[PDB]
Amino acid sequence: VEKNRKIVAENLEKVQAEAERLDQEEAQYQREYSEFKRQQLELDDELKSV
Amino acid sequence: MEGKWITDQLRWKIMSCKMRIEQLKQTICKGNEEMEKNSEGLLKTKEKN
Numbered sequence: 001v002e003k004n005r006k007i008v009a010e011n012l013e014k015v016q017a018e019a020e021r022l023d024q025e026e027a028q029y030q031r032e033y034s035e036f037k038r039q040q041l042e043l044d045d046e047l048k049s050v
Numbered sequence: 051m052e053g054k055w056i057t058d059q060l061r062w063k064i065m066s067c068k069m070r071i072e073q074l075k076q077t078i079c080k081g082n083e084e085m086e087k088n089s090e091g092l093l094k095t096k097e098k099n
Contacts, residue, residue: 001077001081001082004081012092016095
């Protein structure tokens with residue numbers, strides 16, 4: 001029972017950490033998407049201005 | 051008095067074995083409850099994630 005409980009607590013901490021890491025990765029990916037979409041919008045706006 | 055001491059020793063041994071079984075069971079129950087609560091929270095967080 002204690003082995004199971006220790007494994008469970010460790011895995012719960014690991015799952016919380018994995019969720020936080022996924023959140024950070026998603027924030028970075030949203031930043032990259034922001035950069036790419038801003039590039040697309042600026043390029044379209046420049047083509048239109050030209 | 052001597053026989054009383056010897057019998058007290060042996061009977062307290064048997065009783066302590068039972069009591070130890072009991073305390074171990076209580077601890078196992080507490081651990082199982084904690085594990086269930088953690089599993090529930092983990093499931094909810096996993097769904098949200």
